[PDB]
PDB file of N, CA, C and O in Angstrom:
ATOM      1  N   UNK D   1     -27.604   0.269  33.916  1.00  0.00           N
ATOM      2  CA  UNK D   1     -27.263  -0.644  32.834  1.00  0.00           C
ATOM      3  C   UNK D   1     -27.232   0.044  31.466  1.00  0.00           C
ATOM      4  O   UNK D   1     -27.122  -0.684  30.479  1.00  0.00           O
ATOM      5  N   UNK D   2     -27.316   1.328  31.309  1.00  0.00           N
ATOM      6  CA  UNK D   2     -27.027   1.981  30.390  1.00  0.00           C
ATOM      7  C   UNK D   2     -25.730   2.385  29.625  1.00  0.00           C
ATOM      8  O   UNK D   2     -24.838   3.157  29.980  1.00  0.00           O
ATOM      9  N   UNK D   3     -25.849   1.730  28.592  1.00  0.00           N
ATOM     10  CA  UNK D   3     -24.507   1.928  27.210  1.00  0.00           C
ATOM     11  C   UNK D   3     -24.781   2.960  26.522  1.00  0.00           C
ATOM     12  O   UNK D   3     -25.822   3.614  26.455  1.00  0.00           O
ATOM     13  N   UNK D   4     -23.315   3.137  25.763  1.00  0.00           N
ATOM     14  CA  UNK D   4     -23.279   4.222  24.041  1.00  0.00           C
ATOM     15  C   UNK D   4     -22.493   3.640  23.492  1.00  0.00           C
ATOM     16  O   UNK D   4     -21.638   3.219  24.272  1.00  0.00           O
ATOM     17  N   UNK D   5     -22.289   3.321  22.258  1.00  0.00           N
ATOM     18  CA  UNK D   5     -21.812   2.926  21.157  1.00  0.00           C
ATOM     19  C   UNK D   5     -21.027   3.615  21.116  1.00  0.00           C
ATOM     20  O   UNK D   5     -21.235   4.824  21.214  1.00  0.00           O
ATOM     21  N   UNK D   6     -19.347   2.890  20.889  1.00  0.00           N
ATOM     22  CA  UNK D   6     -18.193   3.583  20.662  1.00  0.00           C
ATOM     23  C   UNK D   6     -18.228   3.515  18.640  1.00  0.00           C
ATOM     24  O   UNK D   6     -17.581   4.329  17.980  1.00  0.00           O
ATOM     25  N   UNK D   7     -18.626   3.006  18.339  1.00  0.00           N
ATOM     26  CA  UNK D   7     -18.200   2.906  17.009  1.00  0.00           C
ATOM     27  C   UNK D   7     -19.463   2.166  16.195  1.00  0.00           C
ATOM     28  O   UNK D   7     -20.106   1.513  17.017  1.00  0.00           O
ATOM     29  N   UNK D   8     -19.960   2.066  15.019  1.00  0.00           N
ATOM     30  CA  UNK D   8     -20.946   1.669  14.327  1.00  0.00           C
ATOM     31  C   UNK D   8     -20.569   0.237  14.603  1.00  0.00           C
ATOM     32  O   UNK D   8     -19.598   0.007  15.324  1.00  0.00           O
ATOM     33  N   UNK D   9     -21.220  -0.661  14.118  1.00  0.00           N
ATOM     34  CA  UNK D   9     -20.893  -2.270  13.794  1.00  0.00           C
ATOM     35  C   UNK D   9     -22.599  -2.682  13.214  1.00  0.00           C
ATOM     36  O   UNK D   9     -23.792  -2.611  13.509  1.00  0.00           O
ATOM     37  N   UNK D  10     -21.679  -3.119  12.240  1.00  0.00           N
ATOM     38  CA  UNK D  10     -23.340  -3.756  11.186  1.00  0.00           C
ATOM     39  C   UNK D  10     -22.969  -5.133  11.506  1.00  0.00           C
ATOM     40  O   UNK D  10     -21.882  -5.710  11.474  1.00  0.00           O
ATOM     41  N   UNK D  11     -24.480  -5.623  11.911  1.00  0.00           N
ATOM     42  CA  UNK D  11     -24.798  -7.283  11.922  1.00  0.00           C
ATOM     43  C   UNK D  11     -24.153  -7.835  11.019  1.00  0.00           C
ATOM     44  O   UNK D  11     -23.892  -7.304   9.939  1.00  0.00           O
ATOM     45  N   UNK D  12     -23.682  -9.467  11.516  1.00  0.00           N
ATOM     46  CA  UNK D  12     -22.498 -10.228  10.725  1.00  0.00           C
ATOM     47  C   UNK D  12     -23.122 -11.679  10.797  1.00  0.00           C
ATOM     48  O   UNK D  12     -23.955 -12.221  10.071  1.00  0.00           O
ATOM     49  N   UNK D  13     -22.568 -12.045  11.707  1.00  0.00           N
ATOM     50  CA  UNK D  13     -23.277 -13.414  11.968  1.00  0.00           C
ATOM     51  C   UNK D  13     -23.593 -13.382  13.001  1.00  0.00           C
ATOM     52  O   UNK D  13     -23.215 -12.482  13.750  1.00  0.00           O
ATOM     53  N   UNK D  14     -24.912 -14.989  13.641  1.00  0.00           N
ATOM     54  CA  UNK D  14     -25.588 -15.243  14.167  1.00  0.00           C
ATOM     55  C   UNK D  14     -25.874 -14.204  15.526  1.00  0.00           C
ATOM     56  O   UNK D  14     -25.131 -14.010  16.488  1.00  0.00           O
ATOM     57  N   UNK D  15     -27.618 -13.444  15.151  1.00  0.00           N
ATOM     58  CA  UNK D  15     -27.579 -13.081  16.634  1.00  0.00           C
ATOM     59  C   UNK D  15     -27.226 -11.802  16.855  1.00  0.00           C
ATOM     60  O   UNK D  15     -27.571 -11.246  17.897  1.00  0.00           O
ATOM     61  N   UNK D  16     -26.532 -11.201  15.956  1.00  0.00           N
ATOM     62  CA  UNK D  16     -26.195  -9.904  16.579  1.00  0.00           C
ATOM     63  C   UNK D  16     -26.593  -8.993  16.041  1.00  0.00           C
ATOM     64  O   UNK D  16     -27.039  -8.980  14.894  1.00  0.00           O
ATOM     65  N   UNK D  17     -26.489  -8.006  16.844  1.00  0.00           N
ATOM     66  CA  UNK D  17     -27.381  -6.448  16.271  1.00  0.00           C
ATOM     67  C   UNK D  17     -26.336  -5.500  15.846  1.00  0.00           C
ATOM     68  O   UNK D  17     -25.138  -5.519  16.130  1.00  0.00           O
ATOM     69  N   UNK D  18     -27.145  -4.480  14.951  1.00  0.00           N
ATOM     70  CA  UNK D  18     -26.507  -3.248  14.394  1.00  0.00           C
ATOM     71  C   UNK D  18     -26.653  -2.427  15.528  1.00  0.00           C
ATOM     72  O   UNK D  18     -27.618  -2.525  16.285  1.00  0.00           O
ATOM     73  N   UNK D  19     -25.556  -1.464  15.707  1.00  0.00           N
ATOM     74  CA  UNK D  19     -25.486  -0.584  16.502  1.00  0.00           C
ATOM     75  C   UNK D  19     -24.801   0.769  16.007  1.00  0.00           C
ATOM     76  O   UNK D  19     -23.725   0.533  15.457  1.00  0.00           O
ATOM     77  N   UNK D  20     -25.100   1.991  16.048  1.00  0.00           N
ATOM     78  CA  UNK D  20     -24.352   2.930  15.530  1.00  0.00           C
ATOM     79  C   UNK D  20     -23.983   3.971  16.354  1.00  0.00           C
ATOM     80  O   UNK D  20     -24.904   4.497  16.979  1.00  0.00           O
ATOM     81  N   UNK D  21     -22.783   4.435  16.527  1.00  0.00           N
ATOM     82  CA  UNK D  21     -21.697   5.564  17.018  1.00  0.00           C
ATOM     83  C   UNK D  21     -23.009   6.239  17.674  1.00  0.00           C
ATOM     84  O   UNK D  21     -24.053   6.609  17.137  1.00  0.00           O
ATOM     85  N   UNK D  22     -22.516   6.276  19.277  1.00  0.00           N
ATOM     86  CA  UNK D  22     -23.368   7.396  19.853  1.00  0.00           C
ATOM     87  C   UNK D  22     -24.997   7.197  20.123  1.00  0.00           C
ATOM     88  O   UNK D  22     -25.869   8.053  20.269  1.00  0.00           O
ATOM     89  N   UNK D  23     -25.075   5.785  20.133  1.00  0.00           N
ATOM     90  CA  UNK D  23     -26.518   5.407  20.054  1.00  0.00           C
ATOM     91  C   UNK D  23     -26.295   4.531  21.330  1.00  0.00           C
ATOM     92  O   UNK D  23     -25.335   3.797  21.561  1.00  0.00           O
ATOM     93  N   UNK D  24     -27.695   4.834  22.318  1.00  0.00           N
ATOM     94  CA  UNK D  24     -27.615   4.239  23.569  1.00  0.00           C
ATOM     95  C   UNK D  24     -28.107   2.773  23.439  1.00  0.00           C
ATOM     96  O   UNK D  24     -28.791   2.157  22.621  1.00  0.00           O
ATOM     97  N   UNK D  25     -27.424   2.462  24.672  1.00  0.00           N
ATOM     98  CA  UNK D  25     -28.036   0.557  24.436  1.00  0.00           C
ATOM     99  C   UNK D  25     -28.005  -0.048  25.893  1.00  0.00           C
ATOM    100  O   UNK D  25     -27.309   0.411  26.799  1.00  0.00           O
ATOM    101  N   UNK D  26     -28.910  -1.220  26.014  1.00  0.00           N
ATOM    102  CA  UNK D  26     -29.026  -1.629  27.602  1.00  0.00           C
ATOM    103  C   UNK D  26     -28.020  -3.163  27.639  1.00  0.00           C
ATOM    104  O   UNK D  26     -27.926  -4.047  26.787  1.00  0.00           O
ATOM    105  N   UNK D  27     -27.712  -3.100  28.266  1.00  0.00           N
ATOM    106  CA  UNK D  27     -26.934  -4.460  28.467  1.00  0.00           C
ATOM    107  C   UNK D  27     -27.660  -5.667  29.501  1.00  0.00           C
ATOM    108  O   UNK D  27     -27.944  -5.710  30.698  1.00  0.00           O
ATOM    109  N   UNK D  28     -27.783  -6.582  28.366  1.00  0.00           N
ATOM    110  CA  UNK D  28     -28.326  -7.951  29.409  1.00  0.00           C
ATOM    111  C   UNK D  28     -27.178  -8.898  29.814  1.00  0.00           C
ATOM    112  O   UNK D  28     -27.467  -9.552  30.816  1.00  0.00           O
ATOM    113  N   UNK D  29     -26.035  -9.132  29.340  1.00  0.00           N
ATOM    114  CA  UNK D  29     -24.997  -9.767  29.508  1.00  0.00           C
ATOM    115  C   UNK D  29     -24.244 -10.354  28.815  1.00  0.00           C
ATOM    116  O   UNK D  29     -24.563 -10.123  27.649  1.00  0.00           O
ATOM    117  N   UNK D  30     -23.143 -11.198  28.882  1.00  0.00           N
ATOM    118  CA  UNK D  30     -21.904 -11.269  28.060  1.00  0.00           C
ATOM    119  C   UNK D  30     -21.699 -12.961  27.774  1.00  0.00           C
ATOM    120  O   UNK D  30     -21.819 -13.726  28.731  1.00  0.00           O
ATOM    121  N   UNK D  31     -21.509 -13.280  26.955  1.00  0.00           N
ATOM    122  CA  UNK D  31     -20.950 -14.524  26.052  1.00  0.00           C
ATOM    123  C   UNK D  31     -19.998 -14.900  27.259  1.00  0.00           C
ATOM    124  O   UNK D  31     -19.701 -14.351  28.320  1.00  0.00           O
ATOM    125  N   UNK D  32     -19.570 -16.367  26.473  1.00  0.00           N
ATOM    126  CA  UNK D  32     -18.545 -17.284  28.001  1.00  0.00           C
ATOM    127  C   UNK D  32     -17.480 -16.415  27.958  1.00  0.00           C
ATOM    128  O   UNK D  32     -16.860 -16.328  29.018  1.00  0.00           O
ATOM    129  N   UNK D  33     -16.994 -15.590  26.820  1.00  0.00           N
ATOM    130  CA  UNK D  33     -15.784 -15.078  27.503  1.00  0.00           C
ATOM    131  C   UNK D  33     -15.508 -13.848  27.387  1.00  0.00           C
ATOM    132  O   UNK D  33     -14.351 -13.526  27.659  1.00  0.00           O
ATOM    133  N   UNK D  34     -16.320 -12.955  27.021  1.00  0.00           N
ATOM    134  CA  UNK D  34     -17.200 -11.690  27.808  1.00  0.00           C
ATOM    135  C   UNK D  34     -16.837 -11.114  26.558  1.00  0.00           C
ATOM    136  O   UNK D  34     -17.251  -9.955  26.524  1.00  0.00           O
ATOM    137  N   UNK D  35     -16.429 -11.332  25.850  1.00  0.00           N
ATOM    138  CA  UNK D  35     -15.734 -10.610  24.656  1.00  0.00           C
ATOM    139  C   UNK D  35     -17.566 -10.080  23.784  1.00  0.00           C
ATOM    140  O   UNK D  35     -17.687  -8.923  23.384  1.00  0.00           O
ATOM    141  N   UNK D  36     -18.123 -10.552  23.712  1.00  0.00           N
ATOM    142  CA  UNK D  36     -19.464  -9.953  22.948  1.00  0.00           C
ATOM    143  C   UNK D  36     -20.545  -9.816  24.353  1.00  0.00           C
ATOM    144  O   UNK D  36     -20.503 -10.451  25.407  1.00  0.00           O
ATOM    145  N   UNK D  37     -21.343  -8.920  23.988  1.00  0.00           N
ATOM    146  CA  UNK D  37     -22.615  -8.598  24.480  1.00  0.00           C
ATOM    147  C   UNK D  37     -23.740  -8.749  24.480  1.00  0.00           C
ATOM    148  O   UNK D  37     -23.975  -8.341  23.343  1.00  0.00           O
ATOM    149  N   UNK D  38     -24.831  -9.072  24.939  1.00  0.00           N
ATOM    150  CA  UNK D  38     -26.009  -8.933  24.717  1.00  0.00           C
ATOM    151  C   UNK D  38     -26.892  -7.670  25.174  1.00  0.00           C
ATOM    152  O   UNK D  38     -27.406  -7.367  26.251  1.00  0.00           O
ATOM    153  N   UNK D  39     -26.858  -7.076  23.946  1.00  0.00           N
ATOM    154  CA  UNK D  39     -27.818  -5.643  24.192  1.00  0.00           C
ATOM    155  C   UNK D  39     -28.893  -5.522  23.393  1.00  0.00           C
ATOM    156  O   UNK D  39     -29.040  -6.100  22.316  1.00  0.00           O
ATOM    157  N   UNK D  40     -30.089  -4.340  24.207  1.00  0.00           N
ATOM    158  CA  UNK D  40     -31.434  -4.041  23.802  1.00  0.00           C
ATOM    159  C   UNK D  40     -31.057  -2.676  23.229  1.00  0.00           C
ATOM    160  O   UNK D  40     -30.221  -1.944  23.759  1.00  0.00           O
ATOM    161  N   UNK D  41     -31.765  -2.364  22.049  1.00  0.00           N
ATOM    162  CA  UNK D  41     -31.399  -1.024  21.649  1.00  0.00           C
ATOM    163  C   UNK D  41     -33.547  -0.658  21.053  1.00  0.00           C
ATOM    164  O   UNK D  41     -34.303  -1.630  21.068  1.00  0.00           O
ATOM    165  N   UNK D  42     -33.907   0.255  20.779  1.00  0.00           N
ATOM    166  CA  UNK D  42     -35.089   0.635  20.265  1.00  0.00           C
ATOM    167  C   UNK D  42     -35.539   0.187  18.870  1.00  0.00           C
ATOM    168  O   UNK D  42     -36.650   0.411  18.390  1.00  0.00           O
ATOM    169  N   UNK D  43     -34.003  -0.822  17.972  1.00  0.00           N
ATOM    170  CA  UNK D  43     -34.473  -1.960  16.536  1.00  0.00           C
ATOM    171  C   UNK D  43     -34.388  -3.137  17.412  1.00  0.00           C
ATOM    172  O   UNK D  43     -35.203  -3.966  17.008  1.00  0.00           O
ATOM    173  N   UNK D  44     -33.961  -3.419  18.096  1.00  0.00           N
ATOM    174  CA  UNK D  44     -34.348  -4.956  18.563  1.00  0.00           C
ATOM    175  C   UNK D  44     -33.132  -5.430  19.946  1.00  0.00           C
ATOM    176  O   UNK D  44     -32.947  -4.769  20.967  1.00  0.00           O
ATOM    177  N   UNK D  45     -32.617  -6.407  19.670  1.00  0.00           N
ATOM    178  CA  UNK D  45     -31.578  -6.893  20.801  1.00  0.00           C
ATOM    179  C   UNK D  45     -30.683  -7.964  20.212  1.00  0.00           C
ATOM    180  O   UNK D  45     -31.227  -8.844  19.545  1.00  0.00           O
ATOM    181  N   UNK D  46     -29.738  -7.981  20.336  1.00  0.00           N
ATOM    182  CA  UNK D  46     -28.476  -9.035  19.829  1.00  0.00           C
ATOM    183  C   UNK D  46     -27.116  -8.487  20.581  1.00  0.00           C
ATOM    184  O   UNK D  46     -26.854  -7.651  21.445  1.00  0.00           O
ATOM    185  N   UNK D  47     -26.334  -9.516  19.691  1.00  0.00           N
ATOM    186  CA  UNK D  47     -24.895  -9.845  20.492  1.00  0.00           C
ATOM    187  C   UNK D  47     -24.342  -8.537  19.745  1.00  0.00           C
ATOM    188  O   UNK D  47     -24.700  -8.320  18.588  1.00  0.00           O
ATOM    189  N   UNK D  48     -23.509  -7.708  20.380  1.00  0.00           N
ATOM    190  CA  UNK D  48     -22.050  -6.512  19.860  1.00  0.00           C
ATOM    191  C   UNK D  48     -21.079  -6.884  20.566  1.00  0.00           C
ATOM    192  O   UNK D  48     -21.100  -7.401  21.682  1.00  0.00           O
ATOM    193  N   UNK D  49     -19.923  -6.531  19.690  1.00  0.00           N
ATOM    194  CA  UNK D  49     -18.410  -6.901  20.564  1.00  0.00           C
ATOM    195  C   UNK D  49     -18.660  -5.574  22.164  1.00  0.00           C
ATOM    196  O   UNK D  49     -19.022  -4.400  22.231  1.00  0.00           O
ATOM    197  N   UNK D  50     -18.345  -6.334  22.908  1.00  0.00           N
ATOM    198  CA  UNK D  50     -18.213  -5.978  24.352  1.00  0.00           C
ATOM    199  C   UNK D  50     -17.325  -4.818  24.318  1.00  0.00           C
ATOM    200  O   UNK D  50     -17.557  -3.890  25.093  1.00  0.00           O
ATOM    201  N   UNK D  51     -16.147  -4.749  23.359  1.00  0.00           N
ATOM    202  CA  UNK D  51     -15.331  -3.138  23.266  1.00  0.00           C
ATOM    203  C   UNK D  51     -15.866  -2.242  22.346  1.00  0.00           C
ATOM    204  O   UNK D  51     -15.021  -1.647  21.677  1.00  0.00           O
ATOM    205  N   UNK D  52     -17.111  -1.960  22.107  1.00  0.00           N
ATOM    206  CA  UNK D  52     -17.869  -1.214  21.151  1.00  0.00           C
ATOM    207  C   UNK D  52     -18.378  -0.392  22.100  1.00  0.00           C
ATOM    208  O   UNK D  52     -18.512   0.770  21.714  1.00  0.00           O
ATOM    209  N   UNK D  53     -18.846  -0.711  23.693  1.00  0.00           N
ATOM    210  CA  UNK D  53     -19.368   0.424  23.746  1.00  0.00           C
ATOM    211  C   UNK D  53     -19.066   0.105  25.299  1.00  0.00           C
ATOM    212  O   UNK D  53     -18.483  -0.865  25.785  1.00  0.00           O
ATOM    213  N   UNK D  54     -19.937   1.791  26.236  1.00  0.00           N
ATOM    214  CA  UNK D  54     -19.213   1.737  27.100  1.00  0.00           C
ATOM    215  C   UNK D  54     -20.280   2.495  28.378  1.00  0.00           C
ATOM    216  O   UNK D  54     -21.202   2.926  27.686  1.00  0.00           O
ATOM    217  N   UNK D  55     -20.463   2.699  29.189  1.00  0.00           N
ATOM    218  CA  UNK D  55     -21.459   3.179  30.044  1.00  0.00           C
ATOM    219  C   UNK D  55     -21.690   4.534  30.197  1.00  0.00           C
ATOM    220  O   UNK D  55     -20.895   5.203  30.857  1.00  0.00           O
ATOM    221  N   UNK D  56     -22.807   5.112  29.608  1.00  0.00           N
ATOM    222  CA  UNK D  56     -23.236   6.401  30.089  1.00  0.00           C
ATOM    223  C   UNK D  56     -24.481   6.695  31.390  1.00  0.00           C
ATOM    224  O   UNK D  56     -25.520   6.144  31.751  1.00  0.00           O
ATOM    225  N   UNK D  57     -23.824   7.666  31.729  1.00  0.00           N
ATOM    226  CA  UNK D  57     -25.134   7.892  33.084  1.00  0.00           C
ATOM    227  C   UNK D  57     -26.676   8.210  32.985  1.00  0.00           C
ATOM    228  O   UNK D  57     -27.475   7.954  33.887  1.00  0.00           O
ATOM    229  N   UNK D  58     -26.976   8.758  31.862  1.00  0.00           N
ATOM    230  CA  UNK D  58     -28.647   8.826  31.362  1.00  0.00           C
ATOM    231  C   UNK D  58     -28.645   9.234  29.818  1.00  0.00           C
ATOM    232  O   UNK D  58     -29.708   9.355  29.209  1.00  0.00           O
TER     233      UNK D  58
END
Protein backbone atom coordinates (compact mmCIF):
# COMPACT_ATOMS: atom_id res chain seq x y z
CA UNK A 1 0.00 0.00 0.00
CA UNK A 2 2.84 2.16 -0.47
CA UNK A 3 2.73 5.67 -2.49
CA UNK A 4 5.15 8.73 -3.76
CA UNK A 5 4.00 11.92 -4.54
CA UNK A 6 4.00 12.89 -8.13
CA UNK A 7 3.84 16.55 -7.51
CA UNK A 8 3.54 18.90 -4.24
CA UNK A 9 -0.23 19.85 -3.39
CA UNK A 10 -0.84 22.20 -0.38
CA UNK A 11 -4.09 21.63 1.69
CA UNK A 12 -7.23 23.47 0.23
CA UNK A 13 -10.35 22.47 1.50
CA UNK A 14 -11.97 20.15 3.85
CA UNK A 15 -9.82 17.20 5.01
CA UNK A 16 -7.00 17.12 3.00
CA UNK A 17 -3.37 16.87 3.46
CA UNK A 18 -0.17 18.51 2.18
CA UNK A 19 1.93 16.31 0.35
CA UNK A 20 5.26 17.06 -1.36
CA UNK A 21 7.10 15.73 -4.68
CA UNK A 22 8.82 12.49 -3.81
CA UNK A 23 7.47 12.02 -0.37
CA UNK A 24 6.07 8.53 0.49
CA UNK A 25 2.46 8.00 1.57
CA UNK A 26 0.10 4.98 2.59
CA UNK A 27 -3.18 4.75 1.05
CA UNK A 28 -6.43 3.98 3.01
CA UNK A 29 -8.85 4.59 0.16
CA UNK A 30 -10.71 6.64 -2.34
CA UNK A 31 -13.79 9.11 -2.32
CA UNK A 32 -17.20 7.86 -4.31
CA UNK A 33 -15.53 8.53 -7.39
CA UNK A 34 -12.00 7.66 -6.77
CA UNK A 35 -10.81 10.86 -8.02
CA UNK A 36 -9.21 11.90 -4.33
CA UNK A 37 -7.49 9.77 -1.75
CA UNK A 38 -7.19 9.05 1.57
CA UNK A 39 -3.58 8.94 2.70
CA UNK A 40 -1.26 8.60 5.91
CA UNK A 41 1.95 10.40 5.52
CA UNK A 42 4.47 11.01 8.92
CA UNK A 43 2.33 15.05 9.35
CA UNK A 44 -0.88 13.40 9.60
CA UNK A 45 -3.60 11.83 7.04
CA UNK A 46 -6.15 13.49 4.61
CA UNK A 47 -7.72 13.47 1.23
CA UNK A 48 -4.95 14.17 -2.15
CA UNK A 49 -6.13 14.08 -5.69
CA UNK A 50 -5.79 10.29 -6.56
CA UNK A 51 -3.44 11.49 -9.81
CA UNK A 52 -0.79 12.97 -7.49
CA UNK A 53 0.74 10.02 -6.71
CA UNK A 54 1.53 6.61 -7.57
CA UNK A 55 2.97 3.22 -6.08
CA UNK A 56 6.44 2.56 -5.04
CA UNK A 57 7.85 -0.83 -3.90
CA UNK A 58 9.67 0.22 -0.47
Amino acid sequence: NLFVALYDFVASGDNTLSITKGEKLRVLGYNHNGEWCEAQTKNGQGWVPSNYITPVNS
